[PDB]
Amino acid sequence: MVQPINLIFRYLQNRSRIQVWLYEQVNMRIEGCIIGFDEYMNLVLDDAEEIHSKTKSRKQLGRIMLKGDNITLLQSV
Amino acid sequence: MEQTLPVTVYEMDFLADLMDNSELIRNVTLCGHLHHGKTCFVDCLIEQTHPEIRKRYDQDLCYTDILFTEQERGVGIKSTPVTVVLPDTKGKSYLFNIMDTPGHVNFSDEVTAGLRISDGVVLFIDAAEGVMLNTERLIKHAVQERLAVTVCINKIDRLILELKLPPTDAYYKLRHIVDEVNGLISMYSTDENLILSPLLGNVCFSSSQYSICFTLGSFAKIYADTFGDINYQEFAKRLWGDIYFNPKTRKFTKKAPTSSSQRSFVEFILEPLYKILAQVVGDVDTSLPRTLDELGIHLTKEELKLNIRPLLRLVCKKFFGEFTGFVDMCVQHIPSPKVGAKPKIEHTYTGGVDSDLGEAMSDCDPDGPLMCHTTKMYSTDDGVQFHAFGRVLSGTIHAGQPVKVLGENYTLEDEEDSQICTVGRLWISVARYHIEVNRVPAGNWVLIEGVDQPIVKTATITEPRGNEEAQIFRPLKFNTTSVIKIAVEPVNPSELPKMLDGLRKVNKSYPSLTTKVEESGEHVILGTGELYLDCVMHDLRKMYSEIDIKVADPVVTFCETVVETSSLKCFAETPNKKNKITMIAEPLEKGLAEDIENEVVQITWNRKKLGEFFQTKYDWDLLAARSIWAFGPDATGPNILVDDTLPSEVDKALLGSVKDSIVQGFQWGTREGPLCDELIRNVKFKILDAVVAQEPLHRGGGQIIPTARRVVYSAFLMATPRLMEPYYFVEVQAPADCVSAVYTVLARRRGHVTQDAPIPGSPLYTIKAFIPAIDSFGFETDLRTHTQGQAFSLSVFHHWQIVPGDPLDKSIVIRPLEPQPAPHLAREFMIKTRRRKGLSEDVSISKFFDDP
Amino acid sequence: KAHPPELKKFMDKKLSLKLNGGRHVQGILRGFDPFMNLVIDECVEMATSGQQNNIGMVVIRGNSIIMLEALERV
Amino acid sequence: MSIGVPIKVLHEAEGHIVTCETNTGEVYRGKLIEAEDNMNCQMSNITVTYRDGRVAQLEQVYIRGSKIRFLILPDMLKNAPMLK
Amino acid sequence: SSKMLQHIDYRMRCILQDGRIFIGTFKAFDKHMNLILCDCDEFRKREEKRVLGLVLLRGENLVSMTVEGPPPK
Amino acid sequence: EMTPEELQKREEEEFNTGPLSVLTQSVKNNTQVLINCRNNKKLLGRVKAFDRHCNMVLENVKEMWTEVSKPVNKDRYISKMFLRGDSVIVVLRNPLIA
Amino acid sequence: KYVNGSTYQRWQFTLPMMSTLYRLANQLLTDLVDDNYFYLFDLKAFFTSKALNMAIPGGPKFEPLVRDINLQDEDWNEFNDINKIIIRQPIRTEYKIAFPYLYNNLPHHVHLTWYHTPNVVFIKTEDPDLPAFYFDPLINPISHREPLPDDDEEFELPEFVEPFLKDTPLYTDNTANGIALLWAPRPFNLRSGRTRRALDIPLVKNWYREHCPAGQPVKVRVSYQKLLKYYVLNA
RNA sequence: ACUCUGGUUUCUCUUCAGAUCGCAUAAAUCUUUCGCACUAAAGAUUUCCGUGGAGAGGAACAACUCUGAGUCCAAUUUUUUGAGGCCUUGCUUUGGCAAGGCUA
Ligand SMILES: Nc1nc2c(ncn2[C@@H]2O[C@H](COP(=O)(O)OP(=O)(O)OP(=O)(O)O)[C@@H](O)[C@H]2O)c(=O)[nH]1
Ligand SMILES: [Mg+2]
């Protein structure tokens, strides 16, 4: 049975197109290429980008350290 | 209510509120062998839940065993219910309806009266004695009454303070006990999902002398409250069973490090328990306070001055605390009774689960149609009024509410065994006090006042003006057979009514008691042994009738069998001279009477499955196997009525016209029997031919029932009739040196020793033997006197065996007051029973014919 | 001392998660931590726009999880 | 010294019908199956009142205890032994 | 922490994070300020009183406790 | 934590080298500090002391908060305050004008 | 430390003292670990036998408590019809003491004896050079032969933890002696007690309370039975 | 982790004690029962040997072990924040509240 940070390690082993949702910010999600996590689910993303739902203007961010206290959901593509 | 109840850890409003939520109720029977720790375990639970009720230092408070004969004999005699509120390991309080049942095997019937109203079983096993006679018998009777079985291996201190086993070898002892119980459950149940292991929580380890009680989870929680970061359930999954601890990798391995490491049970559980008991009993003065400081226990200076056994009980009361492993085990592994309502209704209700009332009884709802079921009658100590005890399976009894009590002979077409009785009072029955309640919802046990009059053994209390299609719960199928027969008369005949009154009362108190009057006006009590009938006779002379009562010598009830087919095909015409019946009687195949009695077959089956059984198992043709009419004196009795009437010679519809009366006469004939008016056994009655009258006022009823009994009797007598002896299976627990003494005691009483096997891990032996029950009177007295008390025997009914004589042998002279030799014992056993019965001096084979 | 949330009842079950910002999600549970972050196979997103969006294996932070409903019978 | 009294009352409420309100205003009434030290409540046979007033029937529910505003327990547990 | 063991069984008023009021008999608390209140009536604003019963209020949503009345008999 | 030692003064190595050192500066420099705090308020004062939760004792504070009318910025002066430190957004040493 | 004071009223003893006093009194004590030895030979058994005008063979004989039913004066009812009675073994005196309500018409002032107490399987330790917890050869051997979790599972025991009394030895040099003191007769199962008069201590009361040994002459046998008679009349 | 009780021994008195007051066991008297009463039983009373508890009084040395009381946590799950800002109505106690939509 999969434990979650093992699948985060498998995500960076896959260097997937990880789209991360936000806590309380349902409009803006962030695409990225995941590289590293830690004990507290802080995530660095190589080519991360903001996607709204009303605007949908994907803004490119570069390699970010999105805090663990802000993420909701790590989907792929 | 508001009665004056003792001080308790909970409060009775919380008990009455846990009564409503029937998910938090555990109806539990504590059953085991004699003196295997059940009453002392209930004492430990009572001392846990009652701070003012404390065991004396040198003498164990029993707190059940509330009868005078129980306190004097030391043997539990009646099941005492105890309703406590016990907290779990997680701290959750569950209502516990606990039936402390007698472990003596003669009082096995009392366990059945607890097994009916229970959803689960805690089988108590002496850790020294291991699995004994009544532990095997209550494994069998617990998995056959469809109950969840858990095990409390009580008296583990005997592994420490008596045998002084090493902790590895006492682990081997406990593992052998758990393996023996697993083998017995796999023997008496095809299912293997009820494997008992302490890893599952099914097995609890205990010492009710010293108030030790732990499962693996509750011992792991002592580590979890001592050391914080450990999760105790995962630890409890590793504590038992060939799992070793690696303290360099800190991990539990199946492979043993160092080849001298111990198992996790020995290292983490048994060696701390040994060190606690060894530091108390050996090193109290020198080194008990530093190990007590290591365990977190501080005792007062007044408390360390105690003697070594009360100090052990106190030290383990402070270490182990409450008995939360028992509650772990009975909550995880004994049903809800919401969950346990459906196997209870499927097994014990006569309508089954598929009825409209069986559905509403499987739901177990307190706002349902009232379907209480009482199995025990508890006399108040004035002796006059009884209180029916049982569980509410649906609805709610109320005090003051009129109610419809259905006796055991109530069928839906015979509605006369019912009676509308006003419920007087309701009690939640703890053992030495009763909590008077206004109502009792479903799933709970209740003492009911006022419903005691219309019932003898077993009641189904329903409500009047509804539940018109309400059937009874099944009567208590007992573990054994009440065989020992004593005649009972008053010393002064003028106080016969008191005795008759008292006889009715012992018929209420003892569930497998049979009080009858024979045709000589002789009052007869049937019991399971001499301790059972000694307590019945004590209650008869002291509790119920305050009069003096002569007892006869104990005798046994015999059965009657045949050994060959009947010589001439016997016949009987009715007093009309129409309706000739023509039967032969032949002996049954070997093991078939055991199959009919142990419900391996039923006439409640269809003809296809019944015929398929008798074809594939006993080499019957399907001609004969589809022609079975009935099953002996009851619906499960050891005789068969077959019709081999061809449809060419007999009209089959005209034969099915009188099938009911021929079946009734056959059942009555096998119930009495022509040798000595005691049950016919292991006889196949083949109706060869049957003339039937054409018009129904000439056949049927008063003509064909006594005619069918006469042809059953004559077909039986023309076959070569034999008497059958009840044989007691005797399990003797002797020392190793007293084994040849047990053989010597048994050799004087026609007993054949089956086995003498060492109790593995104890210095004792078990001699399993087969004594005749007519030769077992004072056998345990002979054995314990001859061995100076070192050997001890429990004898329970096993089978019926043919007496070595021939009962129809007028060649045999019997001087009246002599022990007869074996080859004409049956001739002694037949006529004296016939004299006791008062029948004629001899039965001729031609008494029930029509030619003379 | 962080005990794992008691979810082997819900392993391999079809559950509908509610997430923080009025959000919703559906999928098969595959495991957890003591922090109740859930890993999900066959994840269908199910937004409030009304059209159902399959993903597959996702991971959900346990902070954002309001409720589990086991849609499958446990 | 380690575990508090209200979590003991929450463990005492298992099997009973509790009604738990969560952070998003949704009220869940039904049979509390299991509850942990954190207030993670596995409940069952749940009547749900949402914020609008709609009532749904959700037969197996696991609420994360962080989001629980309060639980209304049965008053039977006013006589529970840890509340003495 | 005797500053609220001083307040056990007093009829207390608990203002919450949404602004709702819990007037209940303060039975128990712990280190996380989870309250057990029995016979608790909720007061919200338009005035109405909503009886609840035994409320296990989680400590996250508790702002302020204050006494309404003395402990009953 | 892999540093379970009793003699823990790493928390003011935190306050000399790390991120919170900005306020030990105003413990020692006695500099005016602008605090953007959670109710869209500004607290300018001078922090006397603080530690790891960023709870600060501030002296002689002007606090700014603006109201809608469409926003006019109001002020109130407070003597001296304890500020719970999760109730901040940002903390600012007020800059070198000269 | 060891007694009350100068009044000599209460003593409290160390278990090595009680062990060596138990060993010094070994000749006066029978080393029974039970009262199963006194089955049909205890006080209740003798009160029963006195009440039934029956004599247990090793036991006392009294005057009849009640006037006996003369079994040549009863007049052949249908109850005592000897042609109905199946005789297998003679119903002994012991059976009417053991089950006084089953085997006696008119059991009056009769005492239900204690039944079995479970057989105390205490292995006396012959060798003190043996461990106190030792698989003695009196113990019958246990012939050897489980939902175990996998070793791949990540359950670790934490550093502070080990078994509860790992530093404590399993047995000490006075552990088997204290276990023997558990099964020692009174007063040796005590470690505290109240002081008794030298009159009040019968050194040989539990000698005639045993069965009289084999091979004894008749005068010592009647002496055992009459010591039992006045023991039972006292009690 | 700081402070105030209570002690223990011995001698005596007083009262209660159906509790094995005694893990021991005497004697007297009366009544009953049978013998025909040391060699005999029952019931009851009494006296002795000599207890436990409580209370009280003396006098010997111990006085704070014991029984009590008064006296190291910012990273999901609670207490070191998803917080704050916009729009419509019902009433405005013209401060604004309640519900919903939002935006972050
Ligand atoms: N050594 C030891 N003896 C025990 C233990 N538990 C009970 N006993 C003793 O064993 C005897 C068993 O008596 P009970 O437990 O009361 O009787 P029971 O087990 O309920 O069986 P029944 O007599 O049929 O009711 C008692 O005399 C207890 O003193 C124990 O854990 N260890
Ligand atoms: Mg019992």
Give the CATH number of the domain where residue A7 resides. 2.30.30.100
Locate all alpha helices (DSSP H) within B119-231, ordered by sequence.
Answer: 133-144, 157, 167-187, 216-226
For residue B815, give the amino acid letter: R
Resolution, rounded to a tenth of an Å?
3.3
Crossing angle (nearest 10°) for helices G175-182 and G15-24: 70
The phi and psi torsions of E50 (rounded to 5 degrees) equal -115, 105
Sheet holding B581-587, edge to edge: B570-572, B581-587, B683-690, B640-643, B628-630
Q: How many CB atoms lie within 10 A of CB G1?
A: 5
What's the gap in Å between B76 CA and the centre of ligand 2? 4
Residue G27 neighbours by CB under 8 Å, 6+ apart: none
Alpha helices in B58-166 (DSSP H): 68-73, 108-116, 133-144, 157
Domain assignment present for residue C2? The answer is no
Phi, psi (rounded to 5 degrees) for B735: -70, 175
Measure the CA–CA gap between E41 and E50, rounded to whole angstroms: 5
**Angle CA(E17)–CA(E72)–CA(B436) in degrees, nearest 5?**
115
Residue C21: CB less than 7 A from any atom in strand H: yes
Instruction: Please answer whether residues E63 and E15 qualify as being in contact, where contact means their C-beta atoms are separated by less than 8 angstroms.
Output: yes
Residues 6 or more apart in contact with residue G96 via CB below 8 angstroms: G52, G54, G103, G104
Answer whether any strand H atom is within 7 A of the Cβ of F40.
yes
User: Which among B408, B422, B420 is positioned nearest to B471, based on CA atoms?
Assistant: B408
Rounded Cα distance between B569 and B560, Å, is: 19
Q: Which residues of E touch D72 (CB under 8 A)?
A: 40, 52-56
What is the distance between the alpha carbons of residues B84 and B96, in angstroms, rounded to a whole number?
5
Judge contact between B394 and B470, C-beta under 8 A: no
**Residue B293 has which token pair?**
């400081």
| Cα distance between residue D27 and residue B434, in whole Å | 41
Task: Look up the protein residue whose alpha carbon has the minimum distance to the C1' of H39.
Answer: G226
Q: Tell me the Cα Rg of chain E.
A: 11
The verdict on residue C62 lying in a domain is yes
Residue span of the structural domain in which A40 resides? 3-77
Contact residues, chain D, for B9 at CB < 8 Å: 81
Q: Are strands B203-207 and B148-154 parallel, antiparallel or unpaired?
A: parallel
User: For ligand 1, is residue B512 a contact (CB within 6 Å)?
Assistant: no
For every residue of B780-805, DSSP letters joined together read HHHHHHHTTT--EEEEEEEEEEE-SS
**Amino acid at position C57, single letter:** M
- SS3 state at B739: helix
CA B695 to chain centre: 49
Tokens representing residue B232 in the block: 């105790």
Q: Is D76 on the interface with B (CB under 8 A)?
A: yes
A43 - beta bridge partners?
A: A66
Residue of A nearest to C11 (CA): A1
The crossing angle, in degrees rounded to 10, of helices B779-786 and B739-747 is 140
Please state, in angstroms and rounded to a whole number, the distance separating the CA atoms of residues B488 and B506.
13
Please say whether the beta carbons of B316 and B212 come within 8 A: yes
CB-CB: which of D4, D13, D23 is closest to E30? D4
> Chain G contact for B758, CB < 8 A?
yes
| C1, part of any domain | no
Q: Per CB distance under 8 Å, which residues of C are interface residues toward B?
A: 1, 3
Tell me which DSSP letter residue B551 carries: E
Look at residues B300, B302, B307, B305 and name the one whose alpha carbon lies nearest to residue B281: B307
- HSE-up of residue B238 (Cα within 13 Å, Cβ side): 26
CB F79 within 8 A of CB F64: no
Interatomic CA distance for residues B27 and B94, integer angstroms: 11
Contact B734, B790 (CB under 8 A): yes
How far is residue B312's CA from residue B315's CA, in Å, rounded to a whole number?
A: 5
- CATH code, C40: 2.30.30.100
Q: What are the φ and ψ backbone dihedral angles of B292, each rounded to 5 degrees?
A: -65, -35
Q: CA-to-CA distance for B630 and B637, rounded, in angstroms?
A: 9
Considering Cα of B776, then B781, then B785, then B789, what sign does the dihedral take? Answer: positive
CB atoms within 10 A of CB F2: 3
Q: What is the DSSP string of C8-49?
A: SSSTT-EEEEEETTTEEEEEEEEE--TT--EEEEEEE---TT
Q: Are B448 and B423 in contact (CB under 8 A)?
A: yes
D22: β partners: D68
Q: How many domains does chain A have?
A: 1
Helix (H) / strand (E) containing B746: helix B739-747
Q: B391: part of which helix (H) or strand (E)?
A: strand B386-392
Which residues of B line the annotated binding site for GTP? 32-39, 100-104, 154-157
Pairwise CA distance, residues C42 & B406, whole Å: 58
Method for this entry: cryo-EM
Domains of chain F: residue spans and CATH:
6-98 (2.30.30.100)
Q: How far apart are CA B360 and CA B340, in angstroms?
A: 13
Q: Which residue has the tokens 């309250």?
A: E35
Taking alpha carbons only, the member of B431, B410, B435, B433 closest to residue B420 is: B410
Which of the 202-221 residues on chain G come under 7 Å of nucleic strand H at their beta carbon?
202, 205
User: Which of B419, B427, B429 has the alpha carbon at shortest distance from B455?
Assistant: B419
Q: Are D41 and D71 in contact (CB under 8 A)?
A: yes
Give the residue whose CA is nearest to atom 15 of ligand 1: B37
Amino acid at D72: I
Q: Give the residue from chain C lying closest to D45, CA to CA.
A: C69
Question: Which chain E residues 3-32 have CB under 7 A to strand H?
Answer: 19, 30-32
What are the backbone dihedrals phi and psi of residue B213, each rounded to the nearest 5 degrees, phi first? -155, 120
Using the Cβ of C70 and the Cβ atoms of chain D, whether some distance falls under 8 Å is answered with yes
Report in angstroms the alpha-carbon separations of B125 from B103, B192, B507, B794, G204. 10, 21, 31, 16, 38
* Mutual angle of helices B271-281 and B284-294, in 10-degree steps: 140
CA–CA gap between residue B86 and residue B96 (Å, rounded): 7
Domain that holds residue C29: 8-70
Parse chain D into domains and list their residue ranges: 3-84
Q: Which atom of ligand 1 is nearest to the CA of B60?
A: 29
End-to-end C-alpha distance for chain E, whole angstroms: 25
CA gap B256, B246 in Å, rounded = 8
The Cα B642–Cα B588 span in angstroms is: 12
CB of residue G9 closer than 7 A to nucleic acid strand H? Answer: yes
Strand, coil or helix: A48: strand
Rounded CA separation B94/B26 (Å): 7
| Ligand nearest to the Cα of B157, by number | 1
What the block records as the tokens of G57 is: 């063979």
Q: Closest Cα of chain C to B229: distance in Å?
A: 5
Residue A64, strand partner residues: A45
DSSP of B686-738: EEEEE---SSTTTSSTTTHHHHHHHHHHHHHHHS-EEEEEEEEEEEEEEESTT
To test the contact with chain A by mutation, choose from C55, C61, C63, C64 the residue with the greatest count of A C-beta atoms within 10 A, namely C61
What gap in Å lies between CA B513 and CA B516, rounded to an integer? 10
What does the angle CA B182 – CA B183 – CA B188 come to, to the nearest 5 degrees?
100
Q: Give the H/E segment covering residue B757.
A: strand B752-758
Q: Please give the distance, rounded to the nearest whole angstrom, from the Cα atom of residue B309 to the centre of ligand 1.
A: 14
CA dist A8 and D4 (Å) reads 35
Chains that touch A (3 or more CB pairs under 8 A): C
Structure tokens at G93: 């005196």
Cα–Cα dist B63/B45, whole Å: 10
Q: How far is the CA of B78 from the centre of ligand 2 (A)?
A: 8
Q: Does residue C3 belong to any structural domain of this protein? A: no
Q: Chain H positions under 7 Å from a protein CB?
A: 8-11, 22-26, 33, 37, 40-42, 49-52, 65-68, 72-86, 97-101, 103-104
Fold of D3-84: SH3 type barrels. (2.30.30)
Angle at G83 between CA G81 and CA G84, to 5 degrees: 75
Range B34-63 burial, b when 16+ CB lie within 10 A, else e: bbbbbbbbbbbbbbbbbeebebeeeebbbb
Helix (H) or strand (E) holding D22: strand D17-22
C-alpha span between F52 and F11 (Å, rounded): 7
What distance in Å separates the CA atoms of residue B48 and residue B86, rounded to the nearest whole number?
Answer: 8
Window G:63-122, CB contacts with B under 8 Å: 77-89, 91-92, 94-95, 98-107, 111-122
The number of residues in chain C equals: 74
- Cα atoms in the 13 Å half-sphere on the side-chain side of B399: 15
List CB contacts (< 8 A) between C32 and chain A. Answer: 3-4
Element (H, E) at B234: helix B232-239
**The residue type at B456:** V
Decide if B515 contacts B503 (C-beta within 8 A). yes
Q: Are B125 and B37 in contact (CB under 8 A)?
A: no
Contact C3 B231 (CB under 8 A): yes
Alpha-carbon torsion B350, B355, B361, B367, what sign?
Answer: negative
Q: Which of residues 264-323 of B touch strand H (CB under 7 A)?
A: 298, 300-302
Q: CB under 8 Å to B187, separation ≥6 — which residues?
A: none
B337 CA: distance to closest CA in chain C (Å): 20
Distance set, CA F80 to CA F4, F32, F48, F85 (Å):
36, 14, 10, 15
Instruction: Map residue D35 onto helix, strand or coil.
Output: strand
C56 and A24: CB-CB below 8 Å? Answer: no
Q: Whose CA is nearest to atom 26 of ligand 1?
A: B35
Alpha carbon E2 to its chain centroid, in Å, reads: 17
Helix B308-319 with B271-281: angle, nearest 10 deg: 140
Which residues are CB-contacts of B168 (< 8 A; sequence separation ≥ 6)?
B262, B263, B266
B25 φ/ψ sector (left φ>0, alpha ψ -120 to 50, else beta): beta
**Amino acid at residue number C41:** D
Are B38 and B77 in contact by the 8 Å Cβ rule? The answer is: no
DSSP G150: P
The dihedral through the CA atoms of B537, B538, B542, B547 has a sign that is positive
- Are the CB atoms for C10 and D34 separated by under 8 Å? no
C-alpha distances (whole Å) from F61 to each of F42, F58, F83, F95, F98 are 10, 7, 11, 17, 22
Asked if strand H comes closer than 7 Å to A16 Cβ, the answer is no
* Extended strands (E) in B74-129: 80-87, 93-100, 120-126
Rounded distance between C-alpha atoms, residue B139 and residue B32, angstroms: 9
CA distance G120 to B162: 7
One-letter amino acid of B626: R
| G23-62 residues labelled b (16+ CB within 10 A) or e (exposed) | eeeeeeeeebbbebbbbbbbbbbbbbbbbbebbbebbbee
Helix, strand, coil % (nearest 5) of chain B? Answer: 35, 25, 45
* Rounded CA separation G200/G72 (Å): 47
Count of domains forming chain C: 1
Q: Candidates B36, B39, B75: which one to mutate for ligand 1, based on the most atoms within 8 Å of Cβ?
A: B39
What residues form DSSP beta bridges with F62? F44, F77
Sequence letter at residue B168: T
Q: How far apart are CA B826 and CA B814, in angstroms?
A: 11
- The nearest CA of chain C is from the CA of A26 a distance in Å of 6
Return the structure tokens found at G85.
């009675």
The C-alpha atoms of residue G53 and residue G67 are separated, in whole angstroms, by 9
Closest Cα to atom 18 of ligand 1: B35
Q: Which nucleotide has the least CA–C1' distance to E61?
A: H78
**Angle at the Cα of E11 (from E6 to E17), degrees rounded to 5?**
95
Return the SS3 of B844.
coil
Give φ, ψ of B216 to 5 degrees: -75, -30
| B259 φ/ψ sector (left φ>0, alpha ψ -120 to 50, else beta) | left
